C-alpha cells in the first residue's frame, strides 16, 4: 500500500478500490458508457473483502457489474477482457452479470437494473485519453 488517500465524494473506499452505486436503473450498455464517462468501469471485485462489501452494501436493488460473456457457452470476462477467475459461480443462462441478494446472476442487455462502478485509488489524477 503506497499510501492512504480518500475516494472522491459519492464513492466508497474498500481496499485499493473506489466503488459507486447508481441511484436510477438503466440497461447494461448504458451503465457501462456511464462508468467509462467517469474514467471508471462496471464494478469489478478482486479480493473477497471487496465482494463481501458489494454483497452487504447492495441493499434491495440489484446492480449491474463488470462481467459479460459472448454467449451461454463462452467464459465470463471483466470489462478489460481478463477472464473471470473467482469461485462464486454466476447464476442464469444469460450474457450480462448483476448482483442478486443471493450472489451474482445474469440477464439480457435491455433489463432495467441499477449499476455499480469501480476505479483504483490515488491522491492526484492520471488521465485515459
Amino acid at each position: 500500500i503506497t499510501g492512504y488517500a480518500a475516494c472522491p465524494r459519492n464513492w466508497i473506499g474498500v481496499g485499493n478500490k473506489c466503488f459507486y452505486f447508481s441511484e436510477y436503473a438503466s440497461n447494461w450498455t448504458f451503465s457501462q458508457t456511464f462508468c467509462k464517462a467517469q474514467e471508471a468501469e462496471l464494478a469489478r471485485f478482486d479480493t473477497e473483502e471487496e465482494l463481501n462489501f458489494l454483497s452487504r452494501y447492495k441493499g434491495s436493488f440489484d446492480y449491474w457489474i463488470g462481467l459479460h460473456r459472448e454467449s451461454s457457452e463462452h467464459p465470463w470476462k471483466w470489462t478489460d477482457n481478463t477472464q473471470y477467475n473467482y469461485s462464486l459461480s454466476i447464476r442464469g443462462v444469460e450474457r450480462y452479470a448483476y448482483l442478486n441478494d443471493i450472489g451474482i446472476s445474469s440477464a439480457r442487455v435491455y433489463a432495467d437494473k441499477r449499476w455499480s462502478c469501480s476505479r483504483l485509488n490515488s491522491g492526484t489524477h492520471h488521465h485515459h485519453h
Binding site: 434491495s60 436493488f61 440489484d62 442464469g92 441478494d101 446472476s105 440477464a107 439480457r108 435491455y110 433489463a111
Partner: protein
C-alpha cells in the same frame, strides 16, 4: 380485508416478497400460498405496484411468459396475451418471462432473478 403486511387496491390484495428468484420459482411461491403472480387488469394497477415497489426494486415478475412452440405470450390463467393491452419490449427468440420495470414491461431470461409480487382477493 387484506392479510397483515399485504397491500389492498381495487379489490385485490398484493405482497412484494423480499428475495429475488427465477420466474418458475416465483410462480410456485405465490401458487403455494393460495395466490398467483400478477394478472394485469388495467394500466392503473401497474402504476400502483410500480409506486409500491419504486423504493424497493427496479423491476418485478408478472404471470406472463412466451413459449417458443406457440410463439405466443400467455397469462398464467391460460389466456393468450391481448397484444393491444400491453407493449412488451425485448427479444422473443427463446422462451421469455415478463418483468415490469418502472416505465416498461420486459421480455427476460426466465433464469434471471427478480422480486415478484403475489396477488389474491
Amino acid at each position: 380485508k387484506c392479510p397483515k403486511d399485504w397491500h389492498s387496491h381495487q379489490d385485490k390484495c398484493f405482497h412484494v416478497s423480499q428475495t429475488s428468484i427465477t420466474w418458475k420459482g416465483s410462480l410456485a411461491d405465490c401458487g403455494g400460498k393460495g395466490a398467483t403472480l400478477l394478472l394485469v387488469q388495467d394500466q392503473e394497477e401497474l402504476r400502483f405496484l410500480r409506486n409500491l415497489t419504486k423504493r424497493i426494486s427496479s423491476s418485478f415478475w408478472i404471470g406472463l411468459s412466451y413459449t417458443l412452440s406457440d410463439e405466443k405470450w400467455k397469462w398464467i390463467n391460460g389466456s393468450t396475451l391481448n397484444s393491444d393491452a400491453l407493449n412488451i419490449t425485448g427479444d422473443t427468440e427463446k422462451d421469455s418471462c415478463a418483468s415490469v420495470s418502472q416505465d416498461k414491461v420486459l421480455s427476460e431470461s426466465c433464469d434471471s432473478d427478480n422480486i415478484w409480487i403475489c396477488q389474491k382477493e
